[PDB]
Amino acid sequence: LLKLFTTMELMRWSTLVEDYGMELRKGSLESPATDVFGSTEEGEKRWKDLKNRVVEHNIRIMAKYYTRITMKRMAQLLDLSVDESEAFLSNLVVNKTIFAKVDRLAGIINFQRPKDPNNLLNDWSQKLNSLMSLVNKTTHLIAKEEMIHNLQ
Amino acid sequence: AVQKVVVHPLVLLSVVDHFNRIGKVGNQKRVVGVLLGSWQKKVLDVSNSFAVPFDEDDKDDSVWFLDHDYLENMYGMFKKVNARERIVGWYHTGPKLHKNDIAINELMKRYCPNSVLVIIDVKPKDLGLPTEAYISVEEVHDDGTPTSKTFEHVTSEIGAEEAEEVGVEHLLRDIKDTTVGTLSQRITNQVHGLKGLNSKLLDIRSYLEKVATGKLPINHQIIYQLQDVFNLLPDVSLQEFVKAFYLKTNDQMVVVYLASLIRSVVALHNLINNKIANRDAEKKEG
Amino acid sequence: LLGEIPDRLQFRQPSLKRSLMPYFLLTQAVRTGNLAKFNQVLDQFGEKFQADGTYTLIIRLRHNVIKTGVRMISLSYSRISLADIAQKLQLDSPEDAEFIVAKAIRDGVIEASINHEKGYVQSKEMIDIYSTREPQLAFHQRISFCLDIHNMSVKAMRFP
Amino acid sequence: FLDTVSTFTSYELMDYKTFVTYTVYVSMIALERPDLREKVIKGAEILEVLHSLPAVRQYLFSLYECRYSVFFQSLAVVEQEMKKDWLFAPHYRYYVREMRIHAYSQLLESYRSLTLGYMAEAFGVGVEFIDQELSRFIAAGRLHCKIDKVNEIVETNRPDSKNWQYQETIKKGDLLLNRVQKLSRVINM
Amino acid sequence: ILDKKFHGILDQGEGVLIIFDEPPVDKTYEAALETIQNMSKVVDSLYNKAKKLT
C-alpha cells in the first residue's frame, strides 16, 4: 500500500492484484475485502478507482520528469492501450491536476511546461544561484587551506 | 552555537594599538588579549575588548599565561559601564597557531561555554578580507585517534555601528565613493578572475602535491566533492553551450535593444535642447 | 535603377509639374512589367530624355524592371512556377527564364529552388532572420551614428 | 457624422436617410470591426434608420457574419450608389479593394495555413481571380501575407508584433536627426 | 479569434487545433509611438530655427 505512495516508480498492476487478490482469501477477517471487493457493483467502481490511483500516481511523477514523451511509450508505461490512455488523458486534464499538451498526429505529447517564455529565471538561476557556488570556492577554500597548512 | 562573527574596526584596533604598547618593549610572540563579545543571536558580534599582558615561551612551547586579576576586576569595570558587553572568548594576532593554543581556550571555558578565538593581522598584506576566526569543538577523527580538539574556521565579516563612523571614516578622506554602476562592478570582474583563478592555481598545485608528498590530507572527502559541484558546467572545450548559445545572445537581446533605444531619445533630449539654448544666447547677443 | 521606387508625384511641384510630365509616366511604367507600355514611353517621352542625357540606363533598366516584376511575384507567393510566371511577366519562353533565374541567384535576388523536368520552379519561405540577429546588429551602426552627433553638438557648442 | 439625428433634416442636410447612407459607407472602413458593430447596435437613433433599408443593413451584418458569398453582390449594390453619386467618382477606386482587405483582414487572421480552394467556396468561385487580386494587395503594402501558388496554401504572418514594428523609431528618426544635423552646422555660419 | 474570445490557431492538413496566447505587445508600441510624437517636437521647432536665423 504505502510502497506505491512513497518514491513511486513503476510496478505491474497485476502484481498489485496478486497482493490485493489474496485479501479475498485472506482471513480470519474478510470484511476489508467484503465492503470493497465483495460487492460487485461497488467493487467494479473501486477497481477502476484503484486504476485511478495507480495510473495518476504515474502521471504525477511523470509531470515532474517531462520534458516530453511519445504516445506509444505511455501505453507500455501505464500498462494499457493508447485509447485507455486518451481516456485517462481526458479525465485527468479536465480535473486540471497536470497541464498537458497532447499532439496525436506525430504521437509526441508532454506534461507542462507552459511554452517556455521564461527569461529571468533562465539567466538568474544561471548567474545568481550557480555562480554563488562558484564564488564560495575561495571562501571555504581558505578555511580548509588553514586546516591542511597548520598540520602539514 | 557560533556560526559567523562580526568584527568592528574599533575592537580590532584594540589589538593594533596594543601592538604599539608591547611592540616598543618587545620582545617575542605577539599581542594577545581577551575578547568581549556582544551576542544578540546565533550571529556573533564584537564591540569592545581589553588587552592583557601575555607571553608564550618557545622551549617550553606549551607555556602560556593570561593575567586573571586583570580579567576579573576589569570585567566588573566594563560590566558597570556596559551591562550587555561580556567576554565571549579571546584573540591574538597569529599569524598562525602553534599547537599550544589548545590549552588557552579550555582554561577560560569557566567564563564562557564556548570561547571563540579571533586571529587578527596588524599589517594588512594578503589575500583579502583579513584576520580570521576559530571555534573550539571536538570532532575526534575517523582514523581512531583519542578525542581530538581542533579549532574549526569561523567566517569573519566586518560590520558597522551608529556614531562610530564619525572619526573612523573621516581620516581617510581620499576614497572615491563609489561609484556604483560604472567602475564599481567592473574592477571586481578584473579581480574576480585574478583572485578567483589564483587560488585555483595555488590549490591545484597543492592538490598535485598530494600524490607527491603531504598525504594525508586525503583530504577527505571535502576537496573533490564541492569541486564536482563546481562541475555543473566545467566549462571546457568548447563551453558546451549548444543549448546556451542562442540563449547567450538572447540575454543580450533587450540589453542591447534598450541601449539602442535610450541613446536615441537621450540624444533627442541632449542634442535638441543644447542647440536650442545655444543659438538663443549665441546669435541674439551679437 | 534601384528597382524599388514608388510613384514620384509625391515629389512633384506645380512649377516642376509641366516639366516632369514626360518623365512622370516613365516611372509609372517601371512599376509594371509590360513591354508594350514600357516601349511606348520610350518612343513618345524619349525627346525629353535627350536633354538629360539619361539614355545610358534605358538599355539596362529593362533588366531592372524584370527584377522588380519578379520580386513583386516572389514576395507575394511562396512557390512560383516558371511556366506560370513565363507569360505573366511575358518572358515568352522557358529557356530564357532559366537564364534569368540563374542570374537572379547569381545576384542574390531570389532564393527559389528549381526542380527541372519540364521544368518548373518550386520555392519555399525564407526565414530565421528573426529578431536577435538583424536589429541588434544594425543598431551597432545606429548608435555609432548617434554618439558621433553627441560630439557634433559639443563641437558646435564650443564655438560660442 | 457621429451627431446623426441631432442634426435632424434640413434644406442643407437633404434627405437624412441619404445622409445615413453617406456615413454608413465610410463607417465600414474607418470604424473598426469592434466599433463597427458597436455604433449601429448600441447607438439608438441610428439603428432605426438602417433597419428601414434592408439592402444596407444586410451588408452591415453580413460583414460581421464574414460570409464572402454575399459580399461581391451587395458590395456592387453599394458601388452602384457609389458610381451614380457625385463627388464619389474619384473616391470609389480605392474604396473597392479597401472593403475587400477589410473582409480579408479577418479572413487570413483566422488560419495560419489556408487553402484557396476553401476560399473558392466562400468567393464562389475564386480561382484565378484572387490569384492576381491578392497578389496586387501585397505589392501595394496592403495585408502583407504569403500565399503559396499551385500548392494551394496561404501562410500567416506577418508577425508584426516584434520586428518591423520597431522600424518606425529610427526611420522617422533619421530625417528628424538629419534635419537637426544640417541645421546645426548653420549655427554658427 | 476575430472576436478575441479564443486565442489559438488550427491545422487544416493534420487536424490539430493549437492554442497560443504567447505573442505580447509591450515594449514596442511604447517606443515607436513616442517617436511619432517626437516628430512634432522638431517640426514645431523648425519654426523657431528658421525665424531666428533669417
JSON list of C-alpha atoms in Angstrom, two decimals, chain A residues 101-105 115 117, chain E residues 11 14 16 19-22:
[
{"chain": "A", "resi": 101, "resn": "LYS", "atom": "CA", "xyz": [-0.09, 19.37, -24.48]},
{"chain": "A", "resi": 102, "resn": "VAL", "atom": "CA", "xyz": [-1.16, 16.28, -26.45]},
{"chain": "A", "resi": 103, "resn": "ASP", "atom": "CA", "xyz": [-0.37, 16.03, -30.16]},
{"chain": "A", "resi": 104, "resn": "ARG", "atom": "CA", "xyz": [-1.91, 12.92, -31.71]},
{"chain": "A", "resi": 105, "resn": "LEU", "atom": "CA", "xyz": [-0.60, 13.42, -35.26]},
{"chain": "A", "resi": 115, "resn": "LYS", "atom": "CA", "xyz": [5.62, 27.24, -23.77]},
{"chain": "A", "resi": 117, "resn": "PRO", "atom": "CA", "xyz": [8.67, 32.12, -22.31]},
{"chain": "E", "resi": 11, "resn": "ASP", "atom": "CA", "xyz": [-4.24, 22.93, -38.62]},
{"chain": "E", "resi": 14, "resn": "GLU", "atom": "CA", "xyz": [-3.38, 17.07, -39.88]},
{"chain": "E", "resi": 16, "resn": "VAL", "atom": "CA", "xyz": [-4.92, 19.62, -34.64]},
{"chain": "E", "resi": 19, "resn": "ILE", "atom": "CA", "xyz": [-3.85, 27.40, -28.68]},
{"chain": "E", "resi": 20, "resn": "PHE", "atom": "CA", "xyz": [-1.20, 30.06, -28.08]},
{"chain": "E", "resi": 21, "resn": "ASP", "atom": "CA", "xyz": [-1.65, 33.22, -26.01]},
{"chain": "E", "resi": 22, "resn": "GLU", "atom": "CA", "xyz": [2.10, 33.97, -26.37]}
]
